[PDB]
């Protein structure tokens, strides 16, 4: 199933996190993890990122429905985030 | 300079709550309290509807005009709002929608065509759960619908049939969705607050398809006692029960927020393109002739 | 800023530009950009418009709409309106429309009180370039405006056919450019592609009588698609008809005026507005779709 | 129809295409673009990615097959460009 | 120290021409010519297959073998490749697999089963186009197949079977999608480029399929004169002619380089879980006792 | 460096360490790190090995294959192996598996002589700890290790099941291991989890030897999976049933030196690569597997 994952997370933890999805996926470009897993994929990913540890800002994407996501990042009304 | 996209092919639909809408850089946005820009895509923008502590600006108002997306403010009850009207309409539309309309019999025609249009659009939209394509009680009450709307005898008659019928519908879903709730403006549960900021889509979607098409509201095909607020109540019972209702009774039970609430009604309008499709039949009430 | 704009009776358009409209003790308040904050009437207003720079919050027109007013949203100067809801019979006991709606339909669907509509309308087009007088160029009580003023009136009441009266109306411009050109001391042919000040200004003067046709065909509700003159298939209909009115009896000498001694757009724009609002032409627009309407 | 822009853009021009590509789409982060836009609507954008002009980087996905793509990129068998 | 990530769930797929595969910074990595630097995903990739120019360190091998990632060579024909023989298999599946093996019915009973399995790999994996499901040849060509390896006389009988199939497939998708090209490893056009680059990524996938669960790679199924190298073609026959084929003929026509094709195969390949259907698709054959 | 090791009757073991493999003027050459480069042979070549920090390309395996060499990766020393095809009858023309493997399966399908297989290679663990010894410590001619020898002797000839065959190993481990505790001075049992020197230097030594047979059936073709004293449903079985053979004539003596002087893991893991590479070890195990199957 096709999973895009997106890190907003802060170096060297988001160094952190690349190393551990970029072992899963490819790096498309600019913290974007883009590939495909399984439901029993994502459970061995989501556990491995509950071992990371916190301030880890992880948001998973299954097609346009939010699969899961990790930290406190107020993704505020329907699909996006700017703040300027 | 672009043809400015037609309205059938725009498809971002919103309410803000709690915000403030202006122009950042040339792009239209919204601000919370710590900042938090949410850049709309006026390109595709259909319609920004507002609930309370909110406010639009003139030049942001005038820029989502230019492409025409509809503003509107929520406070079923009175809903105010703003066409855009320095664009110059297609004539023959509302033209011929005038002439039929003035004339009482073909006036009761239009507005028996575009009710009975609530059974296309439970037929062309499909993707649903749960109740799914009926659970034996709403394919009844939309055959009892029909049949209410093929009587007809008089505007004043069914004026507020459509209330009965949100209340009804509102209960019929809640007995297999585990919730006693019923029709309220003020109930602080989240199946009435799911199903409070769900008709706002239904009168968006049907105030930017009013907009370049055909009719400005206030020429309706429904009125009396207590049915205020004009056409576009009319045009939005369309997808009121066919598409806000089962999703609403979905994230009201499955039990996450108003934004994955609207996540889930963008995607149902993106996946049929619901904007294009009752552009095109109200296109069958606008140039029947 | 604050301004006051009759339509019928009393001065109940509110143009309000470059202030935020917010709710100050349960009521609708405006804070201006210099700190000032005004109340609004609310017996005295039927139409609130809101020029360049005017926010407004969603409990301002809660109980606007609570107690019977219209809002709208235009440009600078109060006259080009863009954004706005629509007039109706009351806008909360009774969504039905006004009398001038009906009797306007009415007069479309009679045909040869259509064509009696269309004399009337450029009889008044005429009165208009009789009534309205200005402190520079051509005078509207000479020789030759009398001259092709009486001409045109015998030439109204002749006809039957809508191909004559346009070919009248065509012959009323093309005379009247003639008449302005040989008191400017220019030689003159209307266009629109031309890009002198000239034909620029005639241009911006019709799309300000667009703009002030277009108010008032909304401040009485009739919508901006039903002509009489032009074609059934032409967008933006009674604008352009309403505004031929004034396109030959205020437009016409003021642009040539402003293309003479070669003012800027900007202050065009303002000395225009200025006729709109100290003569107040937006009255006697509606009180001319109340004649055309009543009969 | 969802559809997703990824650019690798310079500024200034990297600004102008995010202001000429954000009145389409709804801005995610880390110059991404994801939402829903119609075909037609992708050919009238592709024309004013066209006349955007030179320098531009800009790769859009329909789910993972790349639809269209501007300016002189090097892409491979996982997409990957590389990392840094 | 985390159980070592299970290898039904492995999920990025390579053929790298013209590069240099190691190791940096604990990231294992391949290198073109302009000092640029590539990530191979270890604890998901399943195989690197390494084409002409290219050449891979040990380290780097370790550390793909111990998650399991099997490298092989390029230079249908002679195959040469590399299991991870430092984790301790499960002795249950080949076990079980060498008492079938040994004995020469039990033997065929596997081939017949191993080969009649392409069907279901024709089945189970849909999202095709051109062609499709079937463009009334090529259900006729597996229904032939299934004939043909029903029979199952020896296993030098069908030999050289798939052969004749790989050729009679590549002409006879070819005759919708116009172009005349035949089987052959060194045809200039872009099909046969594209078909040559297309199968090793079914080499691959049987291969790391073949390394956890089951059978070390030369205790074949099929030997002859022309079926060289053993048991990785009998279990890459799932998904050379079911999926590279169909998606071949697309990407050779619709023009596009080799970046979009290996793009296209890794979701065909990585949507259907293809790779851990392999897995517990041959757990049925090892475990059939 | 180059390294040579002996498999069955020829020095065909080629290791080489930290050096990148090419081809050179259309054959298989390798430079080492400080620069200079060798040829291999051909004819003299049946198994090529690529030990730490070593690179290869792809024409050089396929001019390797092309004329029937196999090459394989292994860790530092050349006997942990970790990668590598497999061996069969030939690797170009007749892909079928050697005539071992045909011997092992058919001696482990019969019970009788699975027991006979049992019984010899427990007999071959007694030669082996007889044959091989080492100028430190025990000495393989006392009068204890002969009496446990003669009695274990004759225990294995009169055994005929495989729980008394695991009986009477635990009793050979538990002697020999209170045999060389009393040769050291010390009070020793063996554990796993014990974090001493005495026991984590057995348990590396163990995992040595598990390389070593891993290494040597690899050599003959035989796979890890066919266990024959230790039960079917453990993971890595032969590798255990091969190693305790060695382990108990070498690698308890060796374990049991470098733990007593104590030399750091580094120059004991060379220690045993180097007796491993001079006393020809695999040979002696090849040799081994060699005639439990013709039988």
Known sequence: MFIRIKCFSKQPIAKKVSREVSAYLEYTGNNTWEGHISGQGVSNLQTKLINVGKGVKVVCNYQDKVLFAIGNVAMSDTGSVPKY | MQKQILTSQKRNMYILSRCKVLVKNGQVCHLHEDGNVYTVPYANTVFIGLAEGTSITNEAM?????????????????????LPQADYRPTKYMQNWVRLWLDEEKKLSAAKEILKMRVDSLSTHVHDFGVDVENKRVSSIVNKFDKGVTQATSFESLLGHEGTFVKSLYKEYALEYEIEFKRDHKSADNY???????????????????WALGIDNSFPLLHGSTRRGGLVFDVADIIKTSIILPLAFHAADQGMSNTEFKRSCVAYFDKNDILAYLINNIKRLCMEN
Chains 1, 4 share one sequence.
């Open chain 2, 62 to 82: 005038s820029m989502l005009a230019a492409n025409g997306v509809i503003v509107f403010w929520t406070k079923a009850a009175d809903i105010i709002c703003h």
């Open chain 2, 192 to 210: 009435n607050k799911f199903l409070t900021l769900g008709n706002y889509y239904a009168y968006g979607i049907a105030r930017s398809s009013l």
